[PDB]
């Protein structure tokens, strides 16, 4: 068969701090000369990717040392003795074994850490003159929120949410979304979240 | 055949990755590679004169600030007077200052009393620090002899005696090879052979930190397997007193209150500090004690700043995140930053912000902060050494020190972040699972700063064994003078009764390699502590007591002479081979050899007394045929006893019998060829 | 050092033809296999397809979808490597990446964005968010293709100015909605690059 | 503030009236302008270095040594360019005697 | 692969080599780098500027 | 670091059965392709034979001369290599060495000299050189084995000492002359080792 | 078939001088992967050999960089930018194509370069002692001549025996030994050289 891999998707890293991403594999990737074929891969935000790690554990060249590489025939291990900003992005897990490759997994995303932040819920009911040309949007508008774990729901049900996840940025390295519910006519005649910022469902209507 | 491409190219990788492996651990040993320091000298302000004497100076929160030196026959009246702008007046009346530096020993190295009295104090307590620094590594300062060991030594070019054009009445010709920095790290080359670099660092209030960088360069790079860093200022003149008062720098008090409100200036102090550095795989290799680890050293310079001696704060954040980055570690790892702490309020509040820019912006725990000079005083190309004895004291004491005169935190530096607390209150520091590291900063009048990163020494010496044995190794010292000789006994004396419970094969073991062999040697075989500090008290007065004392100047090569008869008795060597493996080896095999052409084996006749034979009806040892192999038996073991102790014979003497002792053991003949 | 320079971007309709070229510097052409693989909009990494070193076979494998209609080519001579992206759908407008090995993708060059929609080009339709009664934003919506800035108080804010990434409706069009969020009113310009149509909008509740 | 170090090689000099001795307008700057760790720091300074600015001292091996200190900077890299040299103008006439 | 029995562990010991060959001209140009002369200025015996 | 330790030396005739045992300490055994190699004297390397990596099989391929014979084995829980010899012909009296790689022989250990002679151990028949009329001589042969050391004056003179190495003869002994090169007289001692006979001779021509 | 190799098995070196030491193959040993399969390697004078260049032209490590490693697929060259003493004893040059491995081939004799030596040529008799046990071999010594390309005749051949030498360090020169054991009978019935220190034939009898 295929050997499907798995990793933590959302691992935090925040400066001055050694991170520990993962990846397991279903079957054995080491070779018969004992070599793991393993590749740890990261792509920066809005960049080409880079190849960090081969064979589970070895450089590529002009890569920083502050990723280091081990593990068994099963779990992989690449720790970051340095985080930096550049380090931040996503992280991806190849196999060799078979190579066809159809996708390259859910990759690890990677964020700068602060503490768990407050969802700012607003509700904004589609202008007027949107109504004029036959469509409709109310933008619920999730901000400052942190991490990007939130879905959010449309009642009185879902199903013509888009969704809109944004970059974290530098001051703040906070999160925003929009799920963008474009309507009709007719059928425009209330959004709430359950994000791990709070524990109560907070429900506002347009 | 081989498996074609997946036996090869997969056995071809593994040597691509393998010397990968290897010439990356090559870039790491060549730009990270962690040093070791692996002993510490120290004549600090005040008492200290060795770095164990440092500690109580600095964890009881002791300051060095006493008064200006009266030993020197400075005019300390022209220094001193009302109006501040006198041409020839110092503006602070003390500081720390150095009681020894007017002293030194001629005799001891090759320097001639006259030669000696040339000598810069500087010159003169840096040879002193460099014998320090080796015979507390147990490295036999005398054993370092045209081996690469390099010399780095941070200095403050200072007047002493007469004008060189106006000579003098008996240092004519010397007084160049005193009043010249460059002699001030060639003269300790050449006194102990050293033939690595040396080189002379002046950097001012940098100038050792800068050393030591350097030197811990010529470690990463090979070009010494050993280096002495370091530096020194002792001030022979009030000269810079008088200097840095015409600027309005120097505080009244002497004192330096670093990153306090009541500073009124940065002092002034003088004293001296070495490093013996070594890579930390050469030093665990050849098993040289590693106090503490460098691992990772920076040096800038200020830029244009707000003048030649003004700080600057860019540059300083610089270095300092430059020394981390070339450590490989980041501003949390560092769990106490040394900084200058000049002792001014004015290089204080630009430092402090250099401090928490480079730390204080990304931290986890709250950065201890100290300075050095708050308990010495400003001590210059003495500084970015001192710290770093501090520092070394505190990870082998695990106990960080207080910062005097710092209890009102300066209202000019903004501590509200919190992510620095400045060291008013001695802060437990103890090894845990994190590297205790931290960082020793030094920002010179020059506008030279530097900073360097000193981890704790990694806890792998734990796993020694312990043991028990009958070999009473001789404690062995060696002095350059009688009186020396006599104050070598009772300075071990009193570290042996104010430190008890050291082990006498360990006392041996340090005294006998450690120690240079002088010409003055003392050494006595120990069976008790009692036994052994009594003999330490009979040799400080000059009794021979229970030792042996002898004046053996060049004599290191011994003969071996074999006495013929005389030793009827033949009643000793039962106890040497019931107590030596090596008699009770040798003996054997020689036995052995005899055995074959002459029946009689040695064993039974050894365990017998000297009137054995009497009761028998027979002299002690008289029949010729039985007594001549004996003889040879014992005199071949004792012969290879010695040689196993690692006396070798130069010449060899055998009276009448000996000439088969001189066929055996130089060679000649074999054993068994000797025995028959 | 070593360049994987790309090109063949532009405007693509579903049922068209289109190449991407890849020219490699700093190293020998020859004995790297070829690969494109492709970053679909909102996740990462896609495998398309490689060709075996010329040395190796010159043999060419894509993934089952997109088997048969790409074609995968390369050429020593004049050092370059062609993807041959015949009758392009909805799953190719995305990023390209021209990737140094069959199974170790070194490089990654740079990356083109190919699209492939049945849009036309016209400036945005600008409707404004009303606060409830607090955050003050306007849309963007019915705007194509991806040029896009906009600002609030025209360059003016910066801090809590916040413009949404670009969405993709069933129909071909983009969406976007800019956001402030500072209690007071704000103005907002959209600038539409290809056709060059700039709308400005004031908000109030 | 690019890196530049100053690696210069020279031998302790009697320029002008002993520092214990200050003149008349010559008080402040009579160790901050004789002093051999001024010297390297005063390019450095005027110049607008930021870079490993070090005196060294070997006495007339000095300039080859200096070199050697800013080659050994380059090849690792602390600063990008370097100043290596040495300058002895014995200005009392007491060096010769 | 699939062709002969290396189509991969072949690039591996590719990449392995470049990066040896990568990393032992980093230690080249760490000890023994070429340190150009890059410019003279001199004040020696003899009115020489 | 890492050493491909050595042993199985000693005594051996034509027809007997012996073992050399490598001991790997470094690395990890498995994956390492043990293989063995000899030296012929008097010339360079001969490959004897290689076992495939514990998980590439583990089968054997030794030379067409030494198939079967000559088995090759290993193990990791003990990490060791065995070479049992059978029937060593006197064409196995070699030195044998450990290589640690079927086709990359990297360490290559420390060399055992194994010896497959049917001679007996005796003392040498020193036979003079007399100058013809000029260097001075003196003869070895007629000994075996090959420890030896044959000095002119006693150890007294070195300048112009010259022993040559051990020649086999078809009947399995060991041949050597030791000849100084000086104008005169002079005397050369032979110690044999195993059986400790040392002859002593002074030359006239 | 096989890849049969040939080298300058007498290529001399100097102290201070950059040698130039080849090999030429049968075949082609540039693979299809793109890298030439040749091995180069040393045998010191009476030690283990050991690796100094695979794949062609990289090093082994701890090897130092004084050899470097090129060549097509045909023509391979090693050159020594500056040799020593450790850079003396014999080159292997090994393929990597086909492994069955017969032999090691030829191998590049190294020695230290001086002038052409002159010939020593020393007729000794055996001596009476000797004829008594019914063997003889009178021997001609070949002393302090260089190269090591001289054949010794024996006329007035077939039964001598081979002894090469050590080549010194004060001297650099070569010492040759044909023993030409012989019996009782055929001792009451001369040798020569043709080395290059010289060009007739000195010929001496016992």
Known sequence: DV???????????????????????????????????????????????????????????????????????????????????????????????????????????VDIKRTVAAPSVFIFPPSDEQLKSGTASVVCLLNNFYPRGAKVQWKVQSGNSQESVTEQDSKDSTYSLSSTLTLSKADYEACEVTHQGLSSPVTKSF | MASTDSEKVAEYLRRATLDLRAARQRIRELEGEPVAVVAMACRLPGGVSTPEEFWELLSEGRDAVAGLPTDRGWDLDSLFHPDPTRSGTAHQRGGGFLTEATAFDPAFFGMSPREALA?????????????????????????????????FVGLIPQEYGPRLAEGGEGVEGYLMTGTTTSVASGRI?????????????????????????????????????????????????????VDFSRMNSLAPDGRCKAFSAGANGFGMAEGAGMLLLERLSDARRNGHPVLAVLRGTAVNSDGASNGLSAPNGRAQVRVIQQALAESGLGPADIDAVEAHGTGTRLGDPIEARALFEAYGRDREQPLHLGSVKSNLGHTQAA?????????????????????????????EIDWSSGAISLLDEPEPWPAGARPRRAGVSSFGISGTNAHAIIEEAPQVVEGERVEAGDVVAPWVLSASSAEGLRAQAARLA????????????????????????????????????????????????????????????????????????????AGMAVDLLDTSPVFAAALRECADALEPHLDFEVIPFLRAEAARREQDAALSTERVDVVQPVMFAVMVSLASMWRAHGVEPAAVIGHSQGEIAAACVAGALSLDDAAR | EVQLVQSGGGLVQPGRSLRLSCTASGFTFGDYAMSWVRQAPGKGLEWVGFIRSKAYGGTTEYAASVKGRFTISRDDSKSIAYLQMNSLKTEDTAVYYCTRGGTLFDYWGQGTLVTVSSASTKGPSVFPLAPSSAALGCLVKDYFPEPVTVSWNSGALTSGVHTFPAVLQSSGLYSLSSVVTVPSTYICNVNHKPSNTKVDKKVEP
């Not at chain 1, 793991?36 to 450089?59: A, E, F, M, T, V």
């Not at chain 1, 002009?62 to 931040?88: H, N, W, Y």
Request: hydrophobic share 40%; with cysteine; glycine share 10%.
């Open chain 2, 383 to 411: 500084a970015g050494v001192a710290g770093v004895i501090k520092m070394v004291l505190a990870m082998r004491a695990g106990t960080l020190p207080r910062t005097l005169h710092a209890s009102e935190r300066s209202k």
């Open chain 1, 3 to 109: 050997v499907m891999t798995q990793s933590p998707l959302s691992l935090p890293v925040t400066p001055g701090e050694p991170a520990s991403i993962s990846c397991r594999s279903s079957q054995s990737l080491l070779h018969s000369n004992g070599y793991n074929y393993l590749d740890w891969y990261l792509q920066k935000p809005g960049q080409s990717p880079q190849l960090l790690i081969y064979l589970g554990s070895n450089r590529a060249s002009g890569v920083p040392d502050r990723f280091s590489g081990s593990g068994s025939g099963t779990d992989f291990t690449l720790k970051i003795s340095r985080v930096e900003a550049e380090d931040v992005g996503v992280y991806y897990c190849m196999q060799s074994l078979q190579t066809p490759r159809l996708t390259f997994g859910p990759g690890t995303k």
């Open chain 2, 189 to 241: 080359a050449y006194t102990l052979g050293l033939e690595g670099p040396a080189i002379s660092v002046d950097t001012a209030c940098s100038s050792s930190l800068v050393a030591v960088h350097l030197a811990c360069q010529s470690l990463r790079r090979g070009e010494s397997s050993l280096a002495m860093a370091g530096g020194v200022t002792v001030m022979p003149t009030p000269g810079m007193l």
């Open chain 2, 119 to 151: 000598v810069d104090p500087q010159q003169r307590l840096m040879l002193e620090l460099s014998w320090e620094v080796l015979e507390r590594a147990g490295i036999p300062p005398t054993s370092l002899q045209a081996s690469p060991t390099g010399v």
């Open chain 2, 494 to 569: 009193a570290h042996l009764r104010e430190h008890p419970g050291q082990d006498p094969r360990d006392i041996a073991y340090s005294l006998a390699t450690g120690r240079a062999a002088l010409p003055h040697r003392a050494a006595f075989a120990p069976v008790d502590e009692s036994a052994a500090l009594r003999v330490l008290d009979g040799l400080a007065t000059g009794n021979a007591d229970g030792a042996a004392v002898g004046t053996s100047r060049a004599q290191q090569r011994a003969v071996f002479v074999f006495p013929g008869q005389g030793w009827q008795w």
